[PDB]
Scaffold this motif. Structure first.
Motif, PDB file in Angstrom:
ATOM      1  N   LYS A 592       0.799  -1.223   0.000  1.00 31.07           N
ATOM      2  CA  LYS A 592       0.000   0.000   0.000  1.00 31.07           C
ATOM      3  C   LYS A 592       0.838   1.281   0.000  1.00 31.07           C
ATOM      4  O   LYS A 592       0.273   2.378   0.139  1.00 31.07           O
ATOM      5  CB  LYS A 592      -0.953   0.038   1.207  1.00 31.07           C
ATOM      6  CG  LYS A 592      -1.853  -1.189   1.382  1.00 31.07           C
ATOM      7  CD  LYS A 592      -2.878  -1.260   0.270  1.00 31.07           C
ATOM      8  CE  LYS A 592      -4.067  -2.188   0.617  1.00 31.07           C
ATOM      9  NZ  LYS A 592      -4.993  -2.246  -0.549  1.00 31.07           N
ATOM     10  N   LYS A 593       2.160   1.200  -0.161  1.00 26.69           N
ATOM     11  CA  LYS A 593       2.999   2.387   0.001  1.00 26.69           C
ATOM     12  C   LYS A 593       4.104   2.394  -1.043  1.00 26.69           C
ATOM     13  O   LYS A 593       5.086   1.655  -0.911  1.00 26.69           O
ATOM     14  CB  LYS A 593       3.583   2.443   1.412  1.00 26.69           C
ATOM     15  CG  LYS A 593       2.510   2.615   2.498  1.00 26.69           C
ATOM     16  CD  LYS A 593       3.106   3.162   3.764  1.00 26.69           C
ATOM     17  CE  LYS A 593       2.042   3.763   4.656  1.00 26.69           C
ATOM     18  NZ  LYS A 593       2.714   4.450   5.773  1.00 26.69           N
ATOM     19  N   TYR A 594       3.967   3.254  -2.055  1.00 27.67           N
ATOM     20  CA  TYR A 594       4.952   3.334  -3.125  1.00 27.67           C
ATOM     21  C   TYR A 594       4.807   4.665  -3.851  1.00 27.67           C
ATOM     22  O   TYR A 594       3.802   5.368  -3.719  1.00 27.67           O
ATOM     23  CB  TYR A 594       4.795   2.159  -4.108  1.00 27.67           C
ATOM     24  CG  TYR A 594       3.459   2.112  -4.838  1.00 27.67           C
ATOM     25  CD1 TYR A 594       3.263   2.825  -6.016  1.00 27.67           C
ATOM     26  CD2 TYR A 594       2.406   1.336  -4.366  1.00 27.67           C
ATOM     27  CE1 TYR A 594       2.043   2.786  -6.700  1.00 27.67           C
ATOM     28  CE2 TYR A 594       1.174   1.285  -5.048  1.00 27.67           C
ATOM     29  CZ  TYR A 594       1.008   2.008  -6.212  1.00 27.67           C
ATOM     30  OH  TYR A 594      -0.186   1.960  -6.906  1.00 27.67           O
ATOM     31  N   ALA A 595       5.817   4.990  -4.647  1.00 28.89           N
ATOM     32  CA  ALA A 595       5.710   6.120  -5.559  1.00 28.89           C
ATOM     33  C   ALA A 595       6.353   5.755  -6.891  1.00 28.89           C
ATOM     34  O   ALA A 595       7.365   5.051  -6.923  1.00 28.89           O
ATOM     35  CB  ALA A 595       6.364   7.378  -4.979  1.00 28.89           C
ATOM     36  N   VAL A 596       5.759   6.236  -7.986  1.00 28.60           N
ATOM     37  CA  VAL A 596       6.265   6.002  -9.331  1.00 28.60           C
ATOM     38  C   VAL A 596       6.299   7.329 -10.079  1.00 28.60           C
ATOM     39  O   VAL A 596       5.612   8.289  -9.720  1.00 28.60           O
ATOM     40  CB  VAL A 596       5.411   4.979 -10.104  1.00 28.60           C
ATOM     41  CG1 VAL A 596       5.439   3.650  -9.409  1.00 28.60           C
ATOM     42  CG2 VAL A 596       3.981   5.478 -10.215  1.00 28.60           C
ATOM     43  N   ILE A 597       7.117   7.372 -11.132  1.00 27.27           N
ATOM     44  CA  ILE A 597       7.291   8.573 -11.942  1.00 27.27           C
ATOM     45  C   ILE A 597       7.153   8.198 -13.417  1.00 27.27           C
ATOM     46  O   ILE A 597       7.773   7.231 -13.878  1.00 27.27           O
ATOM     47  CB  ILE A 597       8.648   9.247 -11.652  1.00 27.27           C
ATOM     48  CG1 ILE A 597       8.783  10.565 -12.413  1.00 27.27           C
ATOM     49  CG2 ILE A 597       9.807   8.309 -11.970  1.00 27.27           C
ATOM     50  CD1 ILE A 597       9.994  11.408 -11.973  1.00 27.27           C
ATOM     51  N   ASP A 598       6.317   8.938 -14.150  1.00 25.35           N
ATOM     52  CA  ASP A 598       6.115   8.645 -15.563  1.00 25.35           C
ATOM     53  C   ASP A 598       7.235   9.279 -16.389  1.00 25.35           C
ATOM     54  O   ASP A 598       8.158   9.906 -15.860  1.00 25.35           O
ATOM     55  CB  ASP A 598       4.717   9.087 -16.014  1.00 25.35           C
ATOM     56  CG  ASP A 598       4.599  10.589 -16.260  1.00 25.35           C
ATOM     57  OD1 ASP A 598       5.623  11.298 -16.304  1.00 25.35           O
ATOM     58  OD2 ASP A 598       3.451  11.066 -16.412  1.00 25.35           O
ATOM     59  N   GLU A 599       7.161   9.123 -17.712  1.00 24.47           N
ATOM     60  CA  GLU A 599       8.242   9.623 -18.556  1.00 24.47           C
ATOM     61  C   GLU A 599       8.310  11.149 -18.534  1.00 24.47           C
ATOM     62  O   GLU A 599       9.405  11.723 -18.543  1.00 24.47           O
ATOM     63  CB  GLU A 599       8.085   9.095 -19.983  1.00 24.47           C
ATOM     64  CG  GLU A 599       8.932   7.861 -20.263  1.00 24.47           C
ATOM     65  CD  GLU A 599       8.439   7.047 -21.453  1.00 24.47           C
ATOM     66  OE1 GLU A 599       7.210   6.993 -21.685  1.00 24.47           O
ATOM     67  OE2 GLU A 599       9.289   6.459 -22.158  1.00 24.47           O
ATOM     68  N   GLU A 600       7.157  11.823 -18.489  1.00 26.40           N
ATOM     69  CA  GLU A 600       7.126  13.284 -18.469  1.00 26.40           C
ATOM     70  C   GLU A 600       7.663  13.878 -17.172  1.00 26.40           C
ATOM     71  O   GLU A 600       7.863  15.096 -17.109  1.00 26.40           O
ATOM     72  CB  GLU A 600       5.700  13.791 -18.688  1.00 26.40           C
ATOM     73  CG  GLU A 600       5.150  13.565 -20.085  1.00 26.40           C
ATOM     74  CD  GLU A 600       3.715  14.046 -20.223  1.00 26.40           C
ATOM     75  OE1 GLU A 600       2.803  13.363 -19.706  1.00 26.40           O
ATOM     76  OE2 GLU A 600       3.504  15.114 -20.837  1.00 26.40           O
ATOM     77  N   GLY A 601       7.887  13.068 -16.139  1.00 29.29           N
ATOM     78  CA  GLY A 601       8.395  13.542 -14.867  1.00 29.29           C
ATOM     79  C   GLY A 601       7.368  13.615 -13.753  1.00 29.29           C
ATOM     80  O   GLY A 601       7.741  13.926 -12.614  1.00 29.29           O
ATOM     81  N   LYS A 602       6.096  13.343 -14.036  1.00 26.80           N
ATOM     82  CA  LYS A 602       5.071  13.372 -12.999  1.00 26.80           C
ATOM     83  C   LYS A 602       5.262  12.219 -12.021  1.00 26.80           C
ATOM     84  O   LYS A 602       5.563  11.089 -12.416  1.00 26.80           O
ATOM     85  CB  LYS A 602       3.682  13.296 -13.627  1.00 26.80           C
ATOM     86  CG  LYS A 602       2.550  13.594 -12.660  1.00 26.80           C
ATOM     87  CD  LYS A 602       1.202  13.467 -13.345  1.00 26.80           C
ATOM     88  CE  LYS A 602       0.086  13.424 -12.319  1.00 26.80           C
ATOM     89  NZ  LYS A 602      -1.216  13.004 -12.918  1.00 26.80           N
ATOM     90  N   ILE A 603       5.079  12.504 -10.732  1.00 32.94           N
ATOM     91  CA  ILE A 603       5.245  11.519  -9.670  1.00 32.94           C
ATOM     92  C   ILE A 603       3.873  11.200  -9.088  1.00 32.94           C
ATOM     93  O   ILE A 603       3.119  12.110  -8.722  1.00 32.94           O
ATOM     94  CB  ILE A 603       6.211  12.020  -8.585  1.00 32.94           C
ATOM     95  CG1 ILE A 603       7.623  12.164  -9.144  1.00 32.94           C
ATOM     96  CG2 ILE A 603       6.224  11.089  -7.388  1.00 32.94           C
ATOM     97  CD1 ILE A 603       8.639  12.487  -8.066  1.00 32.94           C
ATOM     98  N   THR A 604       3.547   9.912  -9.029  1.00 28.50           N
ATOM     99  CA  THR A 604       2.305   9.410  -8.445  1.00 28.50           C
ATOM    100  C   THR A 604       2.654   8.678  -7.153  1.00 28.50           C
ATOM    101  O   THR A 604       3.477   7.756  -7.166  1.00 28.50           O
ATOM    102  CB  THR A 604       1.579   8.475  -9.421  1.00 28.50           C
ATOM    103  OG1 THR A 604       1.131   9.222 -10.557  1.00 28.50           O
ATOM    104  CG2 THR A 604       0.375   7.801  -8.762  1.00 28.50           C
TER     105      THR A 604
END
Length: 757
Positions: A592-604
């Motif tokens: 339940k605890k993570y962060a990801v970043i897309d190619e454009e640089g946005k962090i989810t």
DNA sequence: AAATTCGCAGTTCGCG
DNA sequence: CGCGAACTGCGAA
């Protein structure tokens, strides 16, 4: 456009009123022909002659059964024969229904607790808020004279402000040199002027913020004291208070009182719900707050009233602006659910589903099951297994794809015809069997809920496609809200099935949905690893992240799309796995605890402290900066330098006290708490000062320098005075910053020994 | 007040 | 007086 319905009583007979806005003209339609009723299931026929005899009392006169009609209705998919009992007055029903159930001969009664005016909307197939009729809107707010203790509304109203398309104005009874202030001589004349203004503008919607529990009750108390007929209703009536739980709600007849507070709190998640906080969240612009004590001192000393008037004007201005933002969405919700915007704006998910289903049941001659009695409620307390959550592969990962099911639980419900009326039906030619739990669902006929849900998903897709070719920006927006609400409605059926209070409760259905969900997600995981050589990094309920251990970005992407082709050919019916996104890096701390970043640089970010409203801004900001350096630059060192600079600042007391505030909601009555943590300790001391604390109150506190129980050193942030007390640098370093960043940096080997100061 | 279960994690207290 | 379980809050899905 239908705005609302109610009824009145003329010579003991009910008279429905339909409130409409047509061609810019307000109109009331009257219907004297609608008869209240309920249903009864009997063990025989010769029992009806006795049952008609049944009677009761309410207003001195006797209550009797007007007429009786035998009808055939489906109940849980099976035809049934029931006796429909008609009555003269809707209030007859509550008075006689218990005694008619008590009768030996009556097995059960149904549809005995549906308010007469909502029954009317349903049985007549009327739908509120249909069409393109523009509604005239008016926000208002008040400023009052508050003194510690006293009695509610003992002080006068000092100003009334309002706002619409023409701007915002303030009515007051002291001279204030501002162009939007209208000055009158007394409190009484100020209220009278506001009534005149409402009457002249004739708004269809009155927008408040917390008007349900402050604004209208204040005005009501003052209007009694000053001898004012507060005739806001379009029929000359005064605002009508209704109890709604432990609080209240206020109707203005012929208008729609839209209290933004219940709407906003259900619609966006914020650490606090002051009007300033909501305005800034929704519109990204600060709004200055003026406190009660300053209002009072300004009025009593006659000094600095401009600040108060401007504050009052801004209240009304932003309330109108928030109204324009949220009313169109709630109007689409009202049209989708088939109940008034007033009701729907004050309803929970569960209630919205029930009203939708009650209407569909009427259209399909489906008798509604009852709300559970106490004995049934207790029998509904067992739980069941939910979503599948994989223990993640902790660490920093590169070139990962997220694959997820489109509408997993609704897909399952329609594909497998999961419904209480298809459950374990006998004599069917075809069935689907839930994995692990084994419930069988007949496929021979569409289930009640499956068929409705199929219609909803298909309408949503048609709307989304129309939206792309709609030129008119306004119409496009309306379609967007409609399609938006259908999705929230579709996604509520799974939960509703397991909701003990639900009429269409079905535990076997709820747990068959999750069982099927676990099966499909785990099957899909096994296949992508064994057949396509992916490694699944993390999975929760309805999607997973994966990558090819040594592979390149294009390889993982191309191979992902290949796997989707493969797997979707294997999945039944409406089940479908999709390519949600590609992410250059992701960091997975725990379940339940993570962060990801897309190619454009946005962090989810999911679950991490950054997204929790109960952690200090200093911890959250710092964790978000650590994650950015890692995801955006893969630069561990830079991250650690960031934590060190933050622990130094805290050590020196350089961190703005505002960033140290901890916001925690009081979840219950203060007396019910078994144990008292810091926010509770603070809340209790405030109650002791006579401050009111009700469930839902947000406690905002800061921890003062000291030792021992944290609750003894915690104070409301508004009482914080840097000259008198210093904040606890050690607490915020050791209990806020380091734990949040530490759980990330432990994967690079860094110790909690490091990094300090 | 009210959709569900799965889950992490902080504060306090009481066990031994 | 260390440590783990109870209570607590909120997010995730």
């Amino acid at each position: 456009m239908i705005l609302d319905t109610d009824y009145i009583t003329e010579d003991g007979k009910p008279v429905i009123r339909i409130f409409k806005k047509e061609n810019g003209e307000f109109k009331i339609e009257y219907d004297r022909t609608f008869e209240p009723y309920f249903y009864a299931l009997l063990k025989d026929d010769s029992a009806i002659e006795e049952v008609k005899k049944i009677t009761a009392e309410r207003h001195g006169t006797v209550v009797t059964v007007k007429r009786v009609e035998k009808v055939q209705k489906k109940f849980l998919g099976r035809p049934v024969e029931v006796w429909k009992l008609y009555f003269t007055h809707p209030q007859d029903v509550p008075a006689i229904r218990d005694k008619i159930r008590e009768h030996p001969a009556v097995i059960d009664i149904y549809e005995y607790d549906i308010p007469f005016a909502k029954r009317y909307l349903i049985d007549k197939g009327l739908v509120p808020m249909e069409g393109d009729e523009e509604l005239k809107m008016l926000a208002f707010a008040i400023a009052t004279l508050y003194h510690e203790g006293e009695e509610f509304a003992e002080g006068p109203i000092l100003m009334i402000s309002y706002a619409d398309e023409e701007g915002a104005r303030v009515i007051t009874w002291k001279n204030v040199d501002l162009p939007y202030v209208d000055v009158v001589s007394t409190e009484r004349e100020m209220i009278k002027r506001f009534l005149r203004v409402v009457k002249e503008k004739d708004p269809d919607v009155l927008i408040t913020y917390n008007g349900d529990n402050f604004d209208f009750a204040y005005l009501k108390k003052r209007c009694e004291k000053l001898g004012i007929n507060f005739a806001l209703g379009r029929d000359g009536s005064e605002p009508k208070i209704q109890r709604m739980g432990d609080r209240f709600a206020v109707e203005v007849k012929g208008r729609i009182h839209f209290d933004l507070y219940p709407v906003i709190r259900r619609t966006i998640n914020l650490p606090t719900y002051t009007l300033e906080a909501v305005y800034e969240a929704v519109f990204g612009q600060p709004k200055e707050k003026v406190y009660a004590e300053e209002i009072t001192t300004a009025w009593e000393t006659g000094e600095n009233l401009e600040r108060v008037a401007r504050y009052s004007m801004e209240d009304a201005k932003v309330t109108y602006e928030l109204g324009k933002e949220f009313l169109p969405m709630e109007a689409q919700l009202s049209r989708l659910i088939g109940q008034s915007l007033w009701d729907v704006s004050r309803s929970s998910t569960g209630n919205l589903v029930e009203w939708f289903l009650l209407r569909k049941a009427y259209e399909r001659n489906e008798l509604a099951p009852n709300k559970p009695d106490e004995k049934e409620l207790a029998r509904r307390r067992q739980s069941y297994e939910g979503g599948y959550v994989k223990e993640p592969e902790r660490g920093l990962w590169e070139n990962i794809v997220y694959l997820d099911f489109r509408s997993l639980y609704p897909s399952i419900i329609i594909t497998h015809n999961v419904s209480p009326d298809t459950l374990n039906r006998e004599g069917c030619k075809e069935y689907d069997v839930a994995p692990q739990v084994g419930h069988r669902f007949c496929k021979d006929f569409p289930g009640f809920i499956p068929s409705l849900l199929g219609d909803l998903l298909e309408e949503r897709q048609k709307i989304k496609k129309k939206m792309k070719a709609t030129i008119d920006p306004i119409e496009r927006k309306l379609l967007d809200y409609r399609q938006r609400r259908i999705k929230i409605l579709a996604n509520s059926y799974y939960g509703y099935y397991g909701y003990a209070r639900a009429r269409w409760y079905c535990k076997e259905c709820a747990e068959s949905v999750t069982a099927w969900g676990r099966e499909y997600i785990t099957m899909t995981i096994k296949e992508i690893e064994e057949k396509y050589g992916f490694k699944v990094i993390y999975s929760d309920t309805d999607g997973f992240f994966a990558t090819i251990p040594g592979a390149d970005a294009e390889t993982v992407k191309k191979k992902a799309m290949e796997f989707l082709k493969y797997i979707n050919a294997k999945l039944p019916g409406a089940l479908e796995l999709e390519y949600e996104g590609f992410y250059k890096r992701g960091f997975f701390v725990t379940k339940k605890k993570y962060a990801v970043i897309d190619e454009e640089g946005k962090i989810t970010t999911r679950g991490l402290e950054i997204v929790r409203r109960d952690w200090s801004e200093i911890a959250k900001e710092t964790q978000a900066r650590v994650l950015e350096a890692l995801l955006k630059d893969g630069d561990v060192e830079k991250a650690v330098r960031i934590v060190k600079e933050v622990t130094e600042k805290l050590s020196k007391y350089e961190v703005p006290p505002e960033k140290l505030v901890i916001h925690i909601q009081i979840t219950r009555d203060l007396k019910d708490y078994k144990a008292t943590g810091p926010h509770v300790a603070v809340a209790k001391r405030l109650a002791a000062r006579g401050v009111k604390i009700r469930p839902g109150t947000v406690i905002s506190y800061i921890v003062l320098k000291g030792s021992g129980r944290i609750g003894d050193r915690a104070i409301p942030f508004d009482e914080f005075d840097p000259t008198k007390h210093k904040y606890d640098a050690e607490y915020y370093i050791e209990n806020q910053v380091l734990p949040a960043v530490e759980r990330i940096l432990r994967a690079f080997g860094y110790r909690k020994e490091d990094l300090r100061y």
